[PDB]
Amino acid sequence: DLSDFASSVLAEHNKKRALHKDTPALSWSDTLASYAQDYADNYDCSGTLTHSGGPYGENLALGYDGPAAVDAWYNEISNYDFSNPGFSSNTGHFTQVVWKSTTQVGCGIKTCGGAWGDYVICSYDPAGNYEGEYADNVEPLA
């Protein structure tokens, strides 16, 4: 059985994906979550967000618990132009949350407290945000 962290974060992803046409639900991966939590264990609580360079897709946040980070990522839909699909600096988290071809997610968390609060990383497989593939993987609202 999943931890409370895993079940709450998975539900928050799949509540949002179900808003979109032809977009399957994700399942949780212990492999992805071990990778994510290992990286969080090593965060320096400095306030900067640097990507891991790994083999999986990746969303990062600072200042939110797990489900609250998912909500912030998904709210980027407000900036996304469905008639000009593609990457942008303030829609790249949203397009990975709903990426049609992604099938599994796993996440980790570390409590920095102080000025920064919680660090959250979610890892995804297959990865989203491939150039030339947005129109086929980022579907409109049902």
Residue numbers in the entry: 158 to 299
From the paper:
Two crystal structures of the CAP domain of pathogen-related yeast protein from Saccharomyces cerevisiae, Pry1CAP, are presented. Our previous studies revealed that Saccharomyces cerevisiae CAP proteins are required for the export of sterols in vivo and they bind cholesterol in vitro. The sterol binding and export properties of these proteins are localized to the CAP domain, which is sufficient to rescue sterol export properties of cells lacking endogenous Pry proteins. The overall monomer surface area for Pry1CAP is 7125 Å2 and its topology is an alpha-beta-alpha sandwich made up of 6 helices, 2 disulfide bonds, 12 beta turns and 1 beta bulge.
Electron density for four 1,4-dioxane molecules were observed in the initial molecular replacement 2Fo − Fc maps when dioxane was present in the crystallization solution; this density is absent in the Mg2+ structure, which does not have 1,4-dioxane in the crystallization solution. Density corresponding to one 1,4-dioxane molecule was observed in the 194 Å3 volume cavity created by the CBM, confirming for the first time the ability of the cholesterol binding site of Pry1 to bind a ligand. In one structure a 1,4-dioxane molecule from the crystallization mixture occupies the CBM cavity confirming its ability to bind hydrophobic ligands. Since a 1,4-dioxane molecule binds to the CBM cavity, and the CBM is verified to be important for cholesterol binding, the effect of 1,4-dioxane on cholesterol binding was tested. 1,4-dioxane inhibits in vitro binding of [3H]-cholesterol to Pry1CAP in a dose dependent manner. However, the inhibition was only observed at relatively high concentrations of 1,4-dioxane, and is possibly due to the increased hydrophobicity of the 1,4-dioxane containing solvent compared to the aqueous buffer. Interestingly, 1,4-dioxane does not bind to other lipid binding sites notably the palmitate binding site of Tablysin-1519 or phosphatidylinositol binding sites of GAPR-12324. The presence of dioxane in the crystallization solution was incompatible with the formation of complexes of Pry1CAP with cholesterol or palmitate and all co-crystallization and soaking experiments yielded crystals with dioxane only. Mg2+ dependent sterol binding by Pry1CAP requires the interaction of both binding sites, likely occuring via dimerization, because Pry1CAP forms dimers in solution, and both crystal structures have a crystallographic dimer in which the CBM and CAP tetrad are connected within a large 7063 Å3 volume cleft.
